[PDB]
């Protein structure tokens, strides 16, 4: 049936090994928060692993409501990782983020002048940038282009040591013009919406160079067909060789992310650790 046996899930876009022409003919409470929690826990744990997170100031723009960030905050706090959280959004955040000395909440719409101001204020703190800005239902290509121009400005001004940027290529049929984004790996997101082509552009900067790379309409075509294949075919599979309480692909994918997460509690196997982590996360987000 709709079963498959896999060595591992597709962690990055470049790994998707097939395509399928998009067909316009085409579930968990708080699934959006779960999607973000997992991707940011994965990104930040990677930075922890490579010594980048230690003592950093994580600047999150477009973080509201940010309910999941509180879990991230407590997690690293318990691991003794020293971090300063700066959450910035034009709208307000979830109250569970209030009253924490180590997290600054800013209600404000960002522009270049404000960006320059916080950089001057934060310097010489090492900065990690996470951006999830959005402009409604399915923004227009012009709005996405505007959002990406902003993320580039964010990076040029903040000079972060690393960044996680919301990345969804404009649809081919709604192309306007080519544009540039930082060089980075394109992390796939488990529990993303059913037919979402959105990913997380993860970058670790070297030298004082963003290494901007061009996105063409040809690339837009590839992104659409690759992500459709993933969403239509891959994510609707049960991974039979994955010995876990839930065998759906998204759980298999979640497992490969959580297995990279650090915990000071000791477990017998990796499975036991992931099971504990998943339980902890679902419980926090109120997912049965």
């Amino acid at each position: 049936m709709d079963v498959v046996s896999l060595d591992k899930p597709f962690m990055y876009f470049e790994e998707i090994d097939n395509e399928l022409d998009y067909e316009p003919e085409s579930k968990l409470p708080y699934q959006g928060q779960l999607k973000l929690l997992l991707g940011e826990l994965f990104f930040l744990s990677k930075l922890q692993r490579h010594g980048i997170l230690d003592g950093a100031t994580v600047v999150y723009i477009g973080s509201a409501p940010g309910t999941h960030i509180r879990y991230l905050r407590d997690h690293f706090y318990n691991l003794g990782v020293i971090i300063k959280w700066m959450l910035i959004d034009g709208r307000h955040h979830d109250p569970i983020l209030n009253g924490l000395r180590d997290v600054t909440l800013v209600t404000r719409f960002v522009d270049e002048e404000y960006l320059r101001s916080i950089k001057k204020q934060l310097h010489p703190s090492k900065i990690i940038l996470i951006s999830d800005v959005a402009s409604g239902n399915e923004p227009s290509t012009a709005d996405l282009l505007s959002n990406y121009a902003l993320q580039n400005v964010m990076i040029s001004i903040l000079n972060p040591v690393a960044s996680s940027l919301k990345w969804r290529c404009p649809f081919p049929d709604q192309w306007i013009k080519d544009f540039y984004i930082p060089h980075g790996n394109k992390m796939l997101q488990p529990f993303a919406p059913s037919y979402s082509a959105e990913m997380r552009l993860l970058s670790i900067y070297t030298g004082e160079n963003m290494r901007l790379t061009r996105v063409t309409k040809s690339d837009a075509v590839n992104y659409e067909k690759k992500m459709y294949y993933l969403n239509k075919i891959v994510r609707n599979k049960v991974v039979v060789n994955f010995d876990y309480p839930n065998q759906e692909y998204d759980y298999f994918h979640m497992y490969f992310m959580l297995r990279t997460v650090y915990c000071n509690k000791t477990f017998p196997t990796t499975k036991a650790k992931v099971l504990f982590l998943q339980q902890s996360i679902f419980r926090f987000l109120n997912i049965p």
């Binding site: 790994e15 490579h50 010594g51 003592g55 003794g80 009253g99 924490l100 010489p124 980075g184 900067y205």
Partner: protein, 445 residues
């Protein structure tokens, strides 16, 4: 309701609108602080002072006042930021003091010739009053916290060879910040000295306590439990020390650092005793023979000066044919990401680098200067250092290392001095010098 009472009782005043909203969440932690019996605490600190700070001339009255003053400082603080700081620091004491500090009150000789020879060939280059008492307190601390605190450095070797003049006690802990905050308070309460706890950006998970005059008191590196679990260790005098075998590897890596070689020329004998101790330890524990037989060590090291990457040929000893040693850690991190590798083995400050074997090529980073004997030629001192760095990984993952270590050590014998032509600079490490100022109710990271 009750939360209001909590805050009002804590602040010793009616919580303003602003204050109630801001402190509302800390309600639970605040209540914990309020219920905590301060008299018992005053007693514990005094008891601690008679044991480890008897020579400090301050009265029980002075101590009691400093403590009670701090546990009520909130009643005279209106700045919300300061209040958060005071709540956080008081919480640390309330929840951890008794577990951390409270519990405290309830064949080398023959290897000296070898050591002199080895070191001679390499010699080619060119602190407050409280430390005494703190060190003594640490001797006890180590015995009572085997699971969360291990020692390395001269003190650990001193436990093997009493003839070692150790300057301080180097430690790795799983709860460094907690330990340092508690100790900073203990010192503050007893001495009245406004100590400052700071974090240095170019070191990994490192924090240090310094006195008012900026004199060094004590520092600590924090490591995760899994790191603590795999660090090679030995049980001695009721405390755990990093395996002298592993420490010898780091000593070799250490001399690649130009600064350390300069220290060598300044005090050769200091290092001789330390090296002699470890040489004997490995000689007796692993049956290593110092016959001067080099074999295939040190491994060939080729540097690409433009890309700051040293290639080490490892095929003669390991399953991976070569190891690419990056001199810029951010570049290594980016390249690993580009390889889609999510599980590089990290050991924090223990190795100051991640280690990844991918398609039979090891990838890692070297945190010390690379010494050159000629234009584009790696100095043998650094080749050994790089070989030593790779062996740390072998030891940390229970892989083979014995023979390679023997060959490395033997390769240091009967060597002529080779001048240093030049050396690479370490990569830059961005970051703020963070700190906790108890007196000022300030925490900045």
């Amino acid at each position: 309701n009750i939360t209001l009472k909590i805050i009002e009782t804590y602040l010793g005043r009616v919580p303003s609108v602003n204050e109630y909203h801001m402190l509302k969440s800390q309600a639970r932690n605040i209540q914990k602080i309020t219920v905590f019996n301060k008299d018992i605490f005053v007693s514990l600190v005094k008891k601690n002072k008679k044991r480890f700070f008897s020579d400090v001339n301050t009265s029980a009255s002075e101590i009691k006042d400093r403590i009670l003053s701090y546990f009520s400082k909130q009643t005279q603080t209106y700045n919300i930021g300061k209040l958060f700081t005071i709540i956080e620091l008081q919480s640390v004491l309330v929840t951890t003091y008794t577990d951390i500090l409270g519990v405290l009150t309830i064949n080398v000789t023959s290897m000296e010739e070898l050591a002199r020879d080895m070191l001679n060939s390499m010699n080619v280059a060119v602190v407050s009053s409280l430390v005494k008492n703190v060190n003594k307190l640490m001797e006890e601390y180590l015995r009572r916290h085997n699971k969360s605190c291990i020692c390395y450095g001269s003190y650990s070797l001193y436990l093997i060879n009493p003839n070692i003049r150790y300057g301080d006690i180097d430690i790795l802990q799983t709860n460094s910040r907690t330990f340092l905050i508690d100790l900073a308070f203990l010192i503050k309460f007893i001495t009245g000295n406004n100590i400052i706890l700071s974090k240095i950006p170019y070191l990994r998970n490192y924090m240090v306590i310094k006195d008012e005059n900026d004199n060094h008191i004590i520092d600590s590196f924090n490591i995760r439990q899994d790191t603590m679990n795999v660090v090679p260790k030995i049980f001695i005098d009721n405390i755990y020390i990093v395996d002298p075998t592993f420490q010898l590897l780091n000593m070799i890596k250490m001399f690649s650092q130009i600064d350390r070689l300069e220290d060598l020329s300044k005090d050769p004998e200091k290092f001789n005793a330390r090296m002699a101790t470890m040489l004997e330890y490995v000689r007796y524990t692993h049956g290593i023979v110092f016959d001067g037989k080099r074999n295939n060590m040190p491994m060939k090291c080729i540097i690409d000066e433009n890309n700051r990457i040293v290639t080490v040929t490892t095929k003669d000893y390991f399953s991976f044919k070569k190891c690419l040693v990056y001199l810029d850690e951010n570049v290594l991190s980016s390249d690993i990401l580009d390889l889609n590798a999510d599980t590089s083995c990290d050991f924090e400050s223990v190795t100051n680098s991640v280690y990844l074997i991918h398609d039979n090529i090891m990838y890692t980073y070297f945190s010390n200067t690379i010494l050159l004997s000629d234009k584009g030629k790696v100095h043998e001192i650094s080749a050994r250092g790089l070989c030593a760095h790779i062996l740390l990984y072998q030891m940390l993952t229970s892989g083979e290392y014995k023979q390679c270590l023997s060959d490395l050590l033997n390769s240091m014998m009967n060597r002529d001095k080779i001048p240093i032509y030049s050396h690479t600079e370490r990569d830059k490490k961005p970051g703020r010098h963070g700190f906790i100022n108890i007196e000022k109710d300030i925490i900045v990271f």
